[PDB]
Amino acid sequence: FASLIERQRIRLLLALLFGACGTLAFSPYDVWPAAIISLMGLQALTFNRRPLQSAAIGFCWGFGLFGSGINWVYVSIATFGGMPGPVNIFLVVLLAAYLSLYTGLFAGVLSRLWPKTTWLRVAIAAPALWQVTEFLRGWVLTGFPWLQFGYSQIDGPLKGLAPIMGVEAINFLLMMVSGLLALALVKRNWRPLVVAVVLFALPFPLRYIQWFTPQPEKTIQVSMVQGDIPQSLKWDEGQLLNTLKIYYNATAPLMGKSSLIIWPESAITDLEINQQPFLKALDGELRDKGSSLVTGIVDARLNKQNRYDTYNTIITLGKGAPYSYESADRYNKNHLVPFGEFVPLESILRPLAPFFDLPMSSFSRGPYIQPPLSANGIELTAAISYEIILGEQVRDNFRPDTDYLLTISNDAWFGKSIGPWQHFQMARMRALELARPLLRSTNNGITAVIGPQGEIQAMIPQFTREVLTTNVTPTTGLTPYARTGNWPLWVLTALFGFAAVLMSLR
């Protein structure tokens, strides 16, 4: 049994098993210790492997993590994309394989510069190189920072580290802690595990410090509405009036009683200019009662060059924010979803390979930093769906005078899969590091109110048409992550990178 692990093909098979165990740590399978096992399974099979041989181990580990965690993408591709089954499976495998290069790149470089299995490789070299490769996965071709082992600790021992340096600190720390556990197992030494136990127990008290301050006499009654609208590519024509009637009939009783009313992404499945009387009259009704509505709409502004820019807008109506087509209380989606809203790199792919379905018209991008939306005297930092998994853009748009965090989204393409849950967990992450309540409204998704510590305050069942009426108290105060950002971690990464690379160049 000891003579079988040294085989290369045995290492690859175990990489799939240990890689797949990582997906059992996210929201649908709330098992946080399944991330340490996956990480310690990564930097324990790569031990005593020459370069270009441990990269295959890392690639297979990544293929087992992104091939079993990111597989809900098949639901959206098969159901809506007009492509045959073999092509649909091919794209999911290709996406898993592509995301596995960064894991493969991490292993091929870790075992090249640091071949010997020592504490320098696992405690120092691995977390610094892991953070760099994770950044590259989240930066190349607009990135895809999905399935990061820092969101699994939203309710865990390491949740206190999120307000200090962000989610990436948990990813950095878990790789360091998991590596020492792997070093202890392989080398049969109690020192690596003793250090790992102490290192893992240090951030536990950090979850009992409240950087925020709840404000009792400023609370409102949010009334986020879950449409349960069936999905379509063209959004249909007759169904345009039905969805407007569904939201309006489910909102009119909520007016007056509720201060803020929130609708999901693309709640109005039409261009903003096309429905002016509906919005102007609705704003008048809300203003006369004392409620403000925040809804996601698609607007095609006319640029100074006489070319339309189809933004993904979040308009605000009602009391405290009168609606006007020239108003500044709008949010335009900056980071578009690859292959869903825009082609990451066209003119080399669209004419070359028209067999794969691509969107004929692509959305435009808004400013990177935008002021918080004003709604009935409340400042909200919007983040449309995919933008909530980006911990940097949300922090940059965040301001001290921000009351709530908005996560207008529509994860109805993926059906009953685990994608909506994993997205919900990442959205839940951007409420503990910023210490602001998060108001997430979705269509056929997890419509919930997240507290200032990544805690689910109120929630409604998925795939049903319901309104989530609850009281939310705004919080004040700045976390160390909000005040500084992600640069304190990159200083630590640079210092560890400088220290580790110098040791590899004796």
Numbering used by the authors: 3 to 508
Provide the authors' own sentences about this structure as they appear in the paper:
Lnt is a 57-kDa protein that is present in diderm bacteria. It converts a diacylated BLP (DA-BLP) to a triacylated BLP (TA-BLP) using glycerophospholipids (GPLs) as acyl donors. The reaction is proposed to proceed by a ping-pong mechanism at catalytic triad residues Glu267, Lys335, and Cys387 (Escherichia coli numbering). Lnt is composed of two equally sized domains, a membrane domain (MD) and a nitrilase-like domain (ND).
